[PDB]
Amino acid sequence: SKVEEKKYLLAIGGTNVNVFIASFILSDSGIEKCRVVAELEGHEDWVKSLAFRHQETPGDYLLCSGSQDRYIRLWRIRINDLIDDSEEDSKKLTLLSNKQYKFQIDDELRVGINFEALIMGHDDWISSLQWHESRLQLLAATADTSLMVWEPDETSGI
Amino acid sequence: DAVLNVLLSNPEYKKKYLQTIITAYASQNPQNLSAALKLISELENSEEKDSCVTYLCFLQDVNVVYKSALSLYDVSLALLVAQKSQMDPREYLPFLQELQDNEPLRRKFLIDDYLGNYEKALE
Amino acid sequence: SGIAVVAVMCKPHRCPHIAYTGNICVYCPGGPDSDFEYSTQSYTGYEPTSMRAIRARYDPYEQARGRVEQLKQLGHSIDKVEYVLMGGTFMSLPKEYREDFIVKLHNALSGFNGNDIDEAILYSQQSLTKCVGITIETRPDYCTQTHLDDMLKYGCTRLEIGVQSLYEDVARDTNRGHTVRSVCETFAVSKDAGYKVVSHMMPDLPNVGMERDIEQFKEYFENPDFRTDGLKIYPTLVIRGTGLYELWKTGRYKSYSANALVDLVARILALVPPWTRIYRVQRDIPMPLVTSGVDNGNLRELALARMKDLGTTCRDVRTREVGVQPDQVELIRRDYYANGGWETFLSYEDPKKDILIGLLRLRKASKKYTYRKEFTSQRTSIVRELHVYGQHQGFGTLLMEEAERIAKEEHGSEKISVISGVGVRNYYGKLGYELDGPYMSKRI
Ligand SMILES: C[C@H]1O[C@@H](n2cnc3c(N)ncnc32)[C@H](O)[C@@H]1O
Ligand code: SF4
C-alpha cells in the first residue's frame, strides 16, 4: 500500500515463521531505496495469507497476517507525529512481545508497528483473507470447508 | 569452588568463560543462584542477559529461577525471567507494575510478603 | 516422541508381468482381476489402511491429510513423519501420474500448491512438519539406472524388493517373472546409490519343504550377495480367489501345522545378525478371510517364547533398543562385505543389558558399479542412515565425527555424501555439508 504521497510499504511472507516488510520511494523514472527494514516475529508456522486494510483514518490503519499455525495475528501501522513514545524513565514494563517496531523510509516519514490482537480457533489451516469496503469486519476461509466472519464486539474489546 | 577459585580472579577469564560460571554456582547443593543472578545484572555491553538466562532456565525450573531473581530486589531482572516461564501475562505483569512505582524501602517490604520471608519482610 | 508412519496406496492397477507370462503371481490375492470389490493388488479391502484408501478413493492429497490429523486427534504430537507406499507396482504406472502423485504427498505437509516436482521439494525442505523419508516398494526388474534416479528426485530413501525365494525353481514355478541371479545384481546398484535395501521373504511356498526353509535363510546372511538391512517375514496364506487355492482344492498343496511354523521362526530369528532388522513376522490380514495357513495373529510373541526355553536370544536391532537405563555405553563397529562394497555398522551398545542407543551405516563406493555423476570424479564414501533413539543428545554428532575420521584415513576418500531426506536436510547444513543434487555432501 501507500502512505500520503509516493512512499510505499510491501509485506513479504512465506516458508518461515516471520513476516518481512520492505519500503521504497518512488521517482520520475523508477524507484530507489528499496531495502528490508522490519522482521515480524510471533508466528509458529508458515504465513499463508496477509493483506492490508484501506486507510480509513488518515495516518492509522491495520494489518492482518494469517498463517499455517491456525492463527490470524493482527498488526497496526501508524504514522509521523503519532508514534506512541515509550522507553522513557517512567517506563510501563513494556512486555517485550509488544516491542513496537520503528524505522524511517528516507528521513521525513517514520512509522511505528506494534501488536494488536490474537485469535485462536479455525480448527485447521486458513486459506484466504478479506477486509470490508467500509466497516470493520474480516473474512477468513479455512481448509476444513468453513467460512466465518470476525468482528470486534462492544463492552469486551476482544 | 575450585573451578571458581581461578576464573573469578583474572579479568580475562570471566570474559571468555563467563557462561561456565553460571553452571559452577547452579550445580551446588546449597544451589547458589543468588550469586549467578548478581553478575548478570552488571552485563552492560550487549544483549548477553538474554543468552545467559535462557541457559540458566534450562538446567533449572524457571519459577525456581523466577523466585530467586525476584529476591535480590531488582525488578527489571525478574521481568526477563517471567517471559520464559509459560505463565499467563495477565498475572505477573500487573504484579510487577505495582512494585515499580513505589519507593525503594516501600518495595523491600512488598517483595518479601510474596515469597515467605516474613522476618525479612518485617525488617 | 518418535516417527509417524503414514501409509498410502496408489491407484489400483495391474502388474506389468501379466502380459508376457499370462498371469500374475500364484499366491497373490486381490487386484482388479479378482472378486474383491475395488481393492488394490495384494490386498482384500478389509484392512485398516485399505479401508481408509477406498473411502478416500485413492486421492493422495486427501488420503494423507486425513491420516496425519487423525494421529494428532489421539494426541501423538507429530512433527517427524515418514511416508511408506504400498500396493501394486507403483513404478509401473505412467510417468505423468507418478510425479504428480509424489508432489501432492509433499503438499500435505508444507502447504505449497503447485505441480513442479523440482520446486515442491524445495518448499518441503524448509517445512516444519517435515518428512524424514519415503519408502517405495517395487520389483527387482524396476531398479535400473532410469528408475533409481527418479526416486532420488521424489525424495525416496528406502526401497523394498520382493525376493521371497532364493531358489531358481520357485521363482519359475510360481510365475514370479524374474531370476534370483538378477536380484543379487540390482542390490549392488541400489546400495551404491545409497538406499536402505529391505527384502521380503516368504516361507511355506509350494515345492519348498520343511528342511529347505532353514538352509534358505542360513544362506541369506552367510552369502555376501544379499546381507540386506531389513526383512519382512511373510508366511504363506491361502486366500479365496488366488492361484494356489485350486492347489489346496484338489489336494496338491497343504500348509504347515501351527506348532512346526512357530518352531521354524524361533530358529530363523536365532540367525539374524545385529545389522539387520525384522519389521514384520506376519502381515495384517483378518483371519476370517484366510482358509489355511497361520491360525492366530500373535506369531511374534509365540516365537519369542519358543526361544526362551532353547537358551537362544534373538539379537535383533528392532528388539535391542530402549523401546531400562544404560548408565554407560561402549563404541563398537562391525565390518562385513555386501554385494560389491565394504559395509560397516557403527553403534553404541551395552553387552550386558543388550540394548542399543544409536546406529549408522557407511559404504565404500565400489568401481564395478556406481553410475552416478557425483560419485565418479573422485573416490568417495557414502553414509546411508543415522538413527538415534531417546543428556542423551550428542549421540548424533559423535557418529558423524567418527564416520568422517574413518573415511579419510581407512577408506582414502575425498568426499563424504549423505542420502538425507528432504525435511532433515537442514540438520546437515549446520554440520558443514552442502547440497549437490539429491545428496548432501562435503569435500573431505
Ligand atoms: C507385496 C508384498 O506382499 C507379500 N505377499 C504377497 N502374497 C502374500 C501371501 N499370500 N501371504 C503373505 N504375504 C504375501 C509379498 O511377499 C510382497 O512382499
Ligand atoms: S506378488 Fe507382487 S508382483 Fe506378484 S502379483 Fe502380488 S503384487 Fe503383483
Side-chain angles (χ1 to χ4, degrees), chain A residues 1-147:
Chain A
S1 65
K2 71 186 293 183
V3 282
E4 179 189 1
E5 177 70 27
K6 287 180 182 178
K7 285 84 175 176
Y8 293 168
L9 297 172
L10 202 152
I12 310 167
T15 205
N16 58 0
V17 298
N18 296 324
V19 177
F20 295 97
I21 294 175
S23 68
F24 59 94
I25 183 169
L26 201 70
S27 70
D28 53 354
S29 63
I31 67 172
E32 63 185 1
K33 296 180 178 66
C34 181
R35 66 183 183 271
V36 180
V37 290
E39 202 272 336
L40 275 291
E41 72 267 14
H43 287 283
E44 191 177 0
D45 203 78
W46 294 0
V47 177
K48 290 177 71 69
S49 179
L50 54 88
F52 275 148
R53 188 179 182 269
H54 67 279
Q55 188 174 182
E56 179 178 0
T57 301
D60 179 76
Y61 59 92
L62 279 76
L63 165 58
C64 187
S65 67
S67 173
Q68 196 171 358
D69 58 357
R70 303 181 182 179
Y71 297 161
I72 197 170
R73 289 177 181 267
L74 282 77
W75 300 101
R76 181 168 177 263
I77 296 97
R78 284 179 287 118
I79 208 65
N80 295 321
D81 290 331
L82 299 174
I83 62 168
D84 190 73
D85 195 1
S86 177
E87 75 187 0
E88 194 63 30
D89 53 356
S90 295
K91 77 279 193 186
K92 275 78 69 178
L93 276 300
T94 189
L95 189 62
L96 189 64
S97 297
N98 296 321
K99 69 185 295 296
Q100 198 266 329
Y101 286 160
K102 180 173 71 176
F103 60 90
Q104 292 182 356
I105 292 175
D106 49 357
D107 52 353
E108 292 176 352
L109 204 151
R110 58 188 291 274
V111 299
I113 300 170
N114 54 2
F115 180 75
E116 181 69 27
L118 170 140
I119 303 168
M120 276 60 253
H122 293 166
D123 195 75
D124 204 80
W125 301 350
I126 65 172
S127 297
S128 296
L129 302 177
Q130 286 293 109
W131 291 98
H132 200 271
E133 290 85 3
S134 65
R135 291 193 298 272
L136 193 64
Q137 288 91 19
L138 189 147
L139 190 64
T142 66
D144 56 352
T145 68
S146 69
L147 186 142

Side-chain angles (χ1 to χ4, degrees), chain C residues 139-417:
Chain C
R139 294 184 73 248
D141 54 355
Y142 280 163
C143 293
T144 63
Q145 297 182 1
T146 307
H147 290 170
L148 286 175
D149 56 356
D150 285 332
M151 297 179 187
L152 294 172
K153 189 181 289 293
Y154 293 164
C156 178
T157 60
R158 183 178 68 188
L159 45 83
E160 295 181 354
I161 300 100
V163 178
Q164 296 165 353
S165 67
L166 300 181
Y167 296 99
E168 290 292 329
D169 59 345
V170 177
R172 184 181 66 244
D173 292 331
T174 59
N175 199 0
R176 179 67 184 169
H178 64 92
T179 59
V180 186
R181 68 178 300 277
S182 65
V183 65
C184 68
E185 199 272 334
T186 191
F187 284 166
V189 298
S190 299
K191 291 174 75 71
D192 286 328
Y195 290 102
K196 181 179 179 180
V197 175
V198 178
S199 65
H200 296 170
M201 300 301 288
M202 289 179 68
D204 196 70
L205 291 177
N207 294 115
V208 46
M210 187 67 203
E211 60 185 358
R212 292 180 66 187
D213 285 329
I214 198 65
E215 284 99 11
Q216 181 181 359
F217 292 154
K218 188 183 265 79
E219 183 180 359
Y220 183 79
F221 300 110
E222 293 179 355
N223 194 356
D225 285 330
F226 304 103
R227 284 184 179 178
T228 61
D229 288 332
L231 287 177
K232 289 184 179 180
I233 304 298
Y234 283 158
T236 300
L237 295 175
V238 178
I239 317 296
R240 185 174 64 246
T242 56
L244 82 164
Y245 184 79
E246 288 85 5
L247 296 176
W248 183 72
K249 182 67 68 68
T250 62
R252 296 178 68 244
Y253 174 73
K254 62 182 73 175
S255 176
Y256 291 160
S257 67
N259 289 318
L261 182 64
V262 66
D263 196 4
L264 182 63
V265 297
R267 293 182 292 175
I268 299 163
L269 296 177
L271 275 72
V272 170
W275 64 85
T276 184
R277 59 188 295 163
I278 306 299
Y279 287 101
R280 299 295 295 161
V281 187
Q282 56 184 349
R283 67 179 296 162
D284 292 331
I285 300 297
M287 59 183 71
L289 295 175
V290 65
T291 63
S292 176
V294 179
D295 293 334
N296 55 1
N298 208 346
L299 186 61
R300 173 66 180 270
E301 186 65 30
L302 292 176
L304 292 174
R306 182 62 174 85
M307 66 179 69
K308 181 61 67 69
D309 53 354
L310 291 175
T312 305
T313 300
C314 181
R315 294 186 66 86
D316 194 5
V317 74
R318 191 262 176 92
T319 309
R320 289 166 69 248
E321 69 268 18
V322 297
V324 178
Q325 302 297 321
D327 293 332
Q328 55 89 28
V329 69
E330 283 87 3
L331 176 62
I332 67 166
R333 53 91 63 85
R334 293 176 176 88
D335 290 330
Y336 61 97
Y337 176 74
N339 59 24
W342 166 38
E343 294 288 332
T344 185
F345 181 75
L346 276 71
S347 66
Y348 281 99
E349 300 287 333
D350 280 334
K352 288 178 91 286
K353 289 181 259 73
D354 200 0
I355 48 97
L356 182 145
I357 303 302
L359 61 92
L360 187 144
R361 274 77 177 272
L362 182 69
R363 183 181 180 87
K364 185 177 184 290
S366 66
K367 299 178 179 68
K368 191 177 172 65
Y369 297 102
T370 316
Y371 67 97
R372 295 294 293 162
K373 181 66 180 293
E374 294 88 4
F375 293 160
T376 306
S377 297
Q378 71 270 18
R379 291 177 290 118
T380 185
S381 66
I382 306 165
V383 55
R384 192 165 65 195
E385 64 178 0
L386 182 140
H387 193 68
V388 178
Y389 283 145
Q391 298 299 109
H392 198 278
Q393 186 68 41
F395 292 100
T397 187
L398 287 175
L399 288 174
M400 298 302 288
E401 182 69 28
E402 185 67 29
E404 185 178 1
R405 199 268 302 161
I406 200 167
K408 183 172 74 175
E409 292 182 353
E410 295 183 356
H411 290 90
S413 296
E414 296 182 356
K415 180 172 73 177
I416 190 167
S417 299

